[PDB]
Amino acid sequence: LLACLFGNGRCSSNRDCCELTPVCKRGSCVSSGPGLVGGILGGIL
Numbered sequence: 001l002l003a004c005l006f007g008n009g010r011c012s013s014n015r016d017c018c019e020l021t022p023v024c025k026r027g028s029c030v031s032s033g034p035g036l037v038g039g040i041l042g043g044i045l
Helices: none
Strands: 023-025 028-030
Touching: none
Parallel strands: none
Antiparallel strands: 023 028
């Protein structure tokens, strides 16, 4: 298994995080998830 270069909760970019946290926001790593609620194309269904 190899999907976590650090995982210390702090990162400088998205590549500075691990698999469990594919996103790097606020100098920290978290779950990226989907884009945003509502949706830019069709906010229904």
